[PDB]
Amino acid sequence: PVEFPKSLRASSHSSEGGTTKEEDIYGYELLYRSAFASYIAPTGAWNLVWFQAADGSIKQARWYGEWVISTVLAPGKALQGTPLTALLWGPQDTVRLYYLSPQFELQEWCWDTKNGADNKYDGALNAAKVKVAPYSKLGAVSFGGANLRVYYQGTNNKLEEYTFGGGQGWKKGATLPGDPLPGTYISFVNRNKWDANPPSIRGYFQTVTGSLAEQVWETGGWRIGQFVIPAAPFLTPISATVSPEKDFPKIHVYWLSVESTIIESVNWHGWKAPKQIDNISVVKADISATSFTRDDGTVDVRIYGTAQLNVLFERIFRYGVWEEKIHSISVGKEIPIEVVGVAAA
Amino acid sequence: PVEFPKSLRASSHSSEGGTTKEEDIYGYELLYRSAFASYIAPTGAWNLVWFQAADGSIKQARWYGEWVISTVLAPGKALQGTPLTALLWGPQDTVRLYYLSPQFELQEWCWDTKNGADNKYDGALNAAKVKVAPYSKLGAVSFGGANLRVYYQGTNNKLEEYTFGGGQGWKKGATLPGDPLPGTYISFVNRNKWDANPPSIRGYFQTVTGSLAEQVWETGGWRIGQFVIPAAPFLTPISATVSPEKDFPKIHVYWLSVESTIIESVNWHGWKAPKQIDNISVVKADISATSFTRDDGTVDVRIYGTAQLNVLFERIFRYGVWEEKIHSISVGKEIPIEVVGVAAA
């Protein structure tokens, strides 16, 4: 078997007090610790997830009754271990996916489905040859329809913005405040509706001290926000998502604990205390959150990431509760392996 | 600060019971979880270590009274996250380093220093265009002088051999027995002297069940060896090294425990029970062991790898003890970060 810390739960079928003896799955055609991007349709009718296959291609898992896997970027297009982040607007007919080339330049993939067409092509961001810090992660938002913002870590470790819209093409945007940890995970969200202008932008990242911090664009340009988590694990995955609950934006910020469990902090008329959403230890690796508002005004959340041993998980917050059924999305060949919980020496 | 499990020690200066409050170093120009290859001179006079920088270049650390860092392969030569493994013979004037290209093909770098020469150049393996499983690790041995063997994981997850020698160039060798875990770490050693023919080859790897296993080559062919560790952490780093102690080959096999501490199994007139060499938790990432025999017949060992938060460590076994001082080798810019031990929720 493989050994796992006895005090941690490897899956939803682990013993209540930790891992004893169980079977878990290794999907070996998913890149180990793959990046994830995602977007659920605002109607909730279908789901998009993007990930990196072991061969380095970028693939898509789309749920519509069942999951369907396809390839969106051929092997050779993306850095092995590229970050990923996605946009969806129109309200839901135009997709952009951002990634890094093997030369650490910002790249853009476009998927347009307006009017029943289907066009897939490289975006113009590639032309700017934006060289980023090699460990940079990526975030992005859209507003006013096709006004786009891409956030990355520049070569001096500051967070940086690139802008698109208004017929201007891609142009360098702001340099953001703060002192980001080299290699920090980052996640940016727009609190206002996809077709609204101005946007209300928030970004989440880890600083050089290990704390978590917030970028705010509201009025008067970029400022550091009130969200402060004094300590978090080194290079903790971070993903945030926002949708209106009872007619006010509900920001959800997710990161990992030292036990590799998912911690959530909500901003909804103020920040609420961080709390663990479940006690199952995921692989310490990129996560991706998305959300939508139901007709009744409540907000559903989906989180994707890597579960033990190497599977793509889907965690579901629906009608106010995290469901205990945590699904896995198969992306290729798999082997089952026995897992035994082992105590410290 | 950054949070770390309170029950684990992040450094030699951590409290005896685990981490309380301390400072640790982030070398952000070392690729996070870099692969490592290494070779100490058979005289013990100097040391070589190879690693991947954050920018994807392959670099070398050389010790001869002091550590000196150099770049041996420019960005673009190696897969981001490439495995690495090294050879040294002549007795000590001929070096090879094996790695993967961004297209997952075996590559070979050569460094020849016979007679005061100083020639770095690409080896002939590159031209064979040998495509391997994208998550393959690498091992290698040399014998009879320049008879070389490179071990890798093929696309069907079997361990495979490529051979060089006898004026034949690089040719496909054997397919090895057993059922290797996809992406297993692998480490191969030659128990006989560098100029001796035949060799006595051992390889260590993890199987599809999570056990650790042994490949054996002796005159007559390959077989599965009697070394069996029934359970180990999933995708545990593995590195082995052999040198004669009192004229008998002393194999040292290293892997990581569930606490990310280094476990050692020695073969020397039989296998000795596995034992933890120290209680300091390393980053669960590639390690690299090397060894030499002193004039008095005793065997020194060096282990390189990633220590918290992201630094290149050197552990030293010398005159029969693991030294309490664990060194760090700076490879670029660094920031100090406060670390606090945190208990489970």
UniProtKB/TrEMBL annotation, chains A, B:
Region (Disordered): 1-20
Chain intervals with Polar residues compositional bias: 9-18
Organism superkingdom: Eukaryota
Gene3D superfamilies reported in the protein's UniProt record: Fucose-specific lectin
Family label: Belongs to the fungal fucose-specific lectin family.
Protein name per the record: Uncharacterized protein
Organism: Arthrobotrys oligospora (strain ATCC 24927 / CBS 115.81 / DSM 1491) (Nematode-trapping fungus)
